[PDB]
DNA sequence: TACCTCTTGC
DNA sequence: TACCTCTTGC
DNA sequence: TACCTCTTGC
DNA sequence: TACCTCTTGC
DNA sequence: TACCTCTTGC
DNA sequence: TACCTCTTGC
């Protein structure tokens, strides 16, 4: 009906506790979405070329050359923690849960409204009861997957603030070459956009692949419930590194008086100790020598850019680093860095077009400190001679700033690592898996990776509101009545988690409000707000 | 009952042959265990610091800095081949079995006895019928896993020799930095123990996590039967390397008279041969060029130390090397080296605190001979020019002792390798798997890795035998009656194996006693004994 | 049986989660208890008289005069949080529970052992199998209630440290007068111990009121399960004070730019506002004037000593105070202060007979800041004149240090307050209710007050081990064989709690380990330990 | 509209 | 809303 | 034609 | 206590 | 002795 | 272990 409401606005998060410490977390979210008619009603294949920037020989990393199909459709993406949980709820989950399971997700569009503008510069807004809001749900997942969280373009993080969907667009194949160089490179290094391989051309259109529903004012649209199928995510971090795996050496001499300099001593000549090592050469059995079952973490090339058919790209790392050689200042390769606007956590009363940022440094110790790496000749005659060792200080290729660890890789059959932790609230929640024959062991952008089909994407678009003069036979762009729509969106994301118990004698890490952060969880006198990032795997767990 | 025995001493190994060549090997083991009261009744958090040794710039590999919780409990660990099989039995298994499956493990403590000492320096020993022996079985596996085999601290390998458990202790988190250096490094390289990250603090106590049973003289304690769930272990070695995979080249000319210099010849110009290769450049099809399905083995960095949050540690390798470029003298990276005492195989009548050792060199050929590696320019114009090849002889980073193979890594989607072989008798049998999201494909310390829960650890401790003067309100350490206990331990480890059959025309490798080793399997005139290590995968098997 | 164990040592704390967010917390506790034979086998009625101290006219508060029956029995008291929960468990309860219910309590004595000493000064300890340990359980509650927590004399807080019961003794009626005085009081103020009112004489003996069980070595003793019946205890604190109850005044003018000095203003002359007040005189309606439903908290006389038949005593207060006019330095009347030894949380390696202390300052804001109180003439003509107001600065009785608030009392039919919060670990858990006709609304020493019968007290005593020369007909004290006993105690305290949910947008207070407290939850390198007090009602709750 | 969640529901 | 179609339908 | 035997049989 | 294992058992 | 609690129990 | 007895039993 025209003058009837088709739904409920619910942003309540329910915690249903079940037998055996299981909890069914039901996150409800609703937002008022604002949508304008498309720039143009057509699909465009556009190429982006920032040649003048990558032509500065030393600037390869700043390459932006790519091709894309620009569609007249908008994308309603809610894949981001900030859309479902507020700080308070997040605290509860993170402090008391041990593991989190992604169960299901359903969403609907209701209370649709379409208005038109008519214009001394004074506008007037009216309701066009007959105008339609086009909704398309790509359930089959034909359209290429384009998670908005990667560009901080999801829905708003505050329930009492209207939001908007993002103009949908996807990558169109293109070949491109760009040879790396440095400040002093002589000549002009090849840097060109080759074009398109017809054999890889894929031009998709919502119209030809998805049934489109036309919603008028009294219409609503709901997707069914979609059940995820993916590994659980842990809310505990490991701390043990190869150096803390197994039975420690027996201390034959213990300290007899308190102090920070009163150590205990093993008490056996390093070369007369009993035990096992993988060094068939020496009889030295030290903590750095003793054999460990496998290897926690791995070393990978840092700030390595590889290039294939379409240009260079950063080689991704699984884990960050951090610790007492750390702490958002040294924050090197591996630690994700989120940049975002006012809709997703930046002080809303802040002016200027500079985003808010943060580098997420996980509590899990599975990274590497290259400065501490080194390689020595197999003969293992120590103290090691300069010619018999390769340090992170010895230059590679005559370059003063590149050492071996920079191109080093220790991934292998003995590598053990953990999946990335949830980044509240700017992080992505679930992600689609690659359609390659051999798949990656994890993704660095989300903890949940649908093994099957991921929920299909939801597209919206304001139907063309034609005037009385329309001539399709003409070359000029069609003139439409300025129309826009505002509709309500409601989602329900359901997780299942397990409550934790206390196994150590000591208490553990817990997120808490205090005198220093207190003002990050309350509005200002102007009504300003912000959502500060929070770590997720606070409690520790044994790794072995 | 006080004057009644609660068990049987059985160290018999049963071989039950079943239909279809399957055998149920039941290894029974019993030992008389001796246990003294703890140093102190308290738990201590101790730090070990051998700064003065790692401060010798060239000595990083000798680092021992670590923290550990020292408990008053002792650990009864029987995870080591030497505890269950004698040479004779091992021979049978190794010579006639093809694969070995770890089935179950159960153990019990019986005939408990507690005595007290009382003291011209003449001691007197009495039975304290009321004194108790505390037994705790961490079935849930809350305590961190600390397999004693890694430090040769399991139970004794001879059934007729009393043994003892080891003082239990586990790693306590700590941060620590140590920058590598060499003899001629100028200045003082950072080498410090930072402390502890509260976020990773885990102080466990037997008392707060495991129910403790108090056993008096007439008491016994038995664990139930525990069934393992892990991949089978093979008792055959592969010998084929990439060079021996598939159809050999057809010899167009065969030799016509015996001799070691009368070879056959392929008989087709190397560049006129038919076949397949992954080198799109040349038409050369040689044995080192012809395409093989995948790659057996992989190259990894040798004598590489990586470092994370707690110090440096050796990067582990999956396989050893060996062969005609071998044989316990060159014995380089990958080959495990065991050091051990008299309880585990060293001549028992030997004096001195120097351990017995051996580097285990597996019969499987899946290693690498770096000296034979090399890399050449893609243009493949040969004979190759010096500037177009990188040999294991060309220095990397200006270091005379470091070549590319030293930092090289060829692990990849085409890598194929085998799990580590059993090392009798000093090797560990089963091992717990890491509690990381992505797990290692194997462990280098044991053939069996419980996919589920590994049998929980068994802890023992002599209950405090207080005197009449005890004041808990005091700071001084409590004085106890010198008490100790001797109890009998009996275990039953069950495997299932498959008998082998003869498929080749030639006979194969078999372990056998002869004129040279004969005296390693018999006691001396003094009653000395020893247990010499033995190889396990004697017979060969096709790999492809 | 003599050589058989009669029990299990269990100090595990189980958390059983049920449907609807309820949790059944089962705290198990076991300790090795050490017990010496009594000083004397007789009951003594002793009077304590510290006349010489209270005779210093200004020292009344230091009075210790009292009479007591000294029994040869010892009391095994486990009524104290520290006996049942370690820091880790306490953290879990306090951070995630909303309310706590005391359900049941059962305990047993097992593995009894009796030894005798025999004596160059060298002692020898033997087992006297026939000697008995007397156990008496006053289930009917005939003996006067004497909770040991009040004098920090409960069982030990660490499961791995033997403990001891306390010599039982109870108050014997006595009359006594002591007139207060001050430094300059002239003459000698009456200060005397009158004696005993026969009409109030109550001499109780364990022997005549409780059946006593004789336990020899192979004996055990268990009480049944006892179910408590008392109000639940909340784990949330209220923060609202009369000034924050109800609908705030409507701000007619809001701030327009961020800042800590940009306030909003009500915007209506204080005497032209609409609303309700209990001041029939004026038309002023201010925040301190507007009528509130009732009164949170109450004002009581501070450092008031009252005196009845047996001497002076401090008038107890229900709530503390604290806040930004606070914080363990100003910590005045109402805030409990615990003093204790090494058995209950003081650094165990600390020497000296000085106790460890702390003043518990509750998170609940229900106290008073006298400095802010005042009283003014009913005519309410302001600004108030000196003669028309009585400030906390105006002297009462010509005394410079006493003001009206000192003798002030605002308890009344409109008073609302909360029960005392749990003080971990030194606080008492449950308490017996007074057998008076009109009972107190709460106790200040414990959150749980059994409405019915509280669990009866458990007494122990070493039976007389006579020598061959005993003549009861003699006046001399009987000579006994030096005997002592060590027995194991195990208890099970069960609570039921409700899990909390997140209702605010902001996160809340949570106990957590950090860089500053980290070392309070881990043993030292000497094996030192300590248990630091923790607050219990961290989360806030609405009061109205 | 039920005692700061779903749920005075099941 | 199911794994680029209709169709995780029949 | 079944995972180097008979036997992916019985 | 059975013919050098479990097993003159099942 | 089951996958850091009770509980691979019910 | 039940509300200072036996008896929160009968
Ligand atoms: Mg469909
Ligand atoms: Mg092509
Ligand atoms: Mg850390
Ligand atoms: Mg169990
Ligand atoms: Mg930290
Ligand atoms: Mg070979
Ligand atoms: Mg009774
Ligand atoms: Mg009288
Ligand atoms: Mg406050
Ligand atoms: Mg409700
Ligand atoms: Mg389909
Ligand atoms: Mg076959
Ligand atoms: Mg037989
Ligand atoms: Mg369990
Ligand atoms: Mg009674």
PDB file of C-alpha atoms (C1' of nucleotides) in Angstrom, chain C residues 107 139-140 204 223 227 453 456, chain I residues 1-8:
ATOM      1  CA  UNK C 107      33.691 -30.294  52.831  1.00  0.00           C
ATOM      2  CA  UNK C 139      25.868 -28.606  62.669  1.00  0.00           C
ATOM      3  CA  UNK C 140      23.218 -27.389  65.076  1.00  0.00           C
ATOM      4  CA  UNK C 204      30.149 -23.905  76.063  1.00  0.00           C
ATOM      5  CA  UNK C 223      29.968 -33.252  55.966  1.00  0.00           C
ATOM      6  CA  UNK C 227      22.446 -25.410  50.835  1.00  0.00           C
ATOM      7  CA  UNK C 453      21.119 -21.568  59.616  1.00  0.00           C
ATOM      8  CA  UNK C 456      27.952 -25.200  61.172  1.00  0.00           C
TER       9      UNK C 456
ATOM     10  C1'  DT I   1      25.608 -29.693  58.616  1.00  0.00           C
ATOM     11  C1'  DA I   2      19.537 -26.330  59.568  1.00  0.00           C
ATOM     12  C1'  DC I   3      18.107 -22.107  62.236  1.00  0.00           C
ATOM     13  C1'  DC I   4      21.604 -23.634  71.260  1.00  0.00           C
ATOM     14  C1'  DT I   5      19.280 -30.787  72.349  1.00  0.00           C
ATOM     15  C1'  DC I   6      17.718 -35.800  70.255  1.00  0.00           C
ATOM     16  C1'  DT I   7      15.426 -33.934  65.273  1.00  0.00           C
ATOM     17  C1'  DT I   8      15.022 -30.481  58.957  1.00  0.00           C
TER      18       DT I   8
END
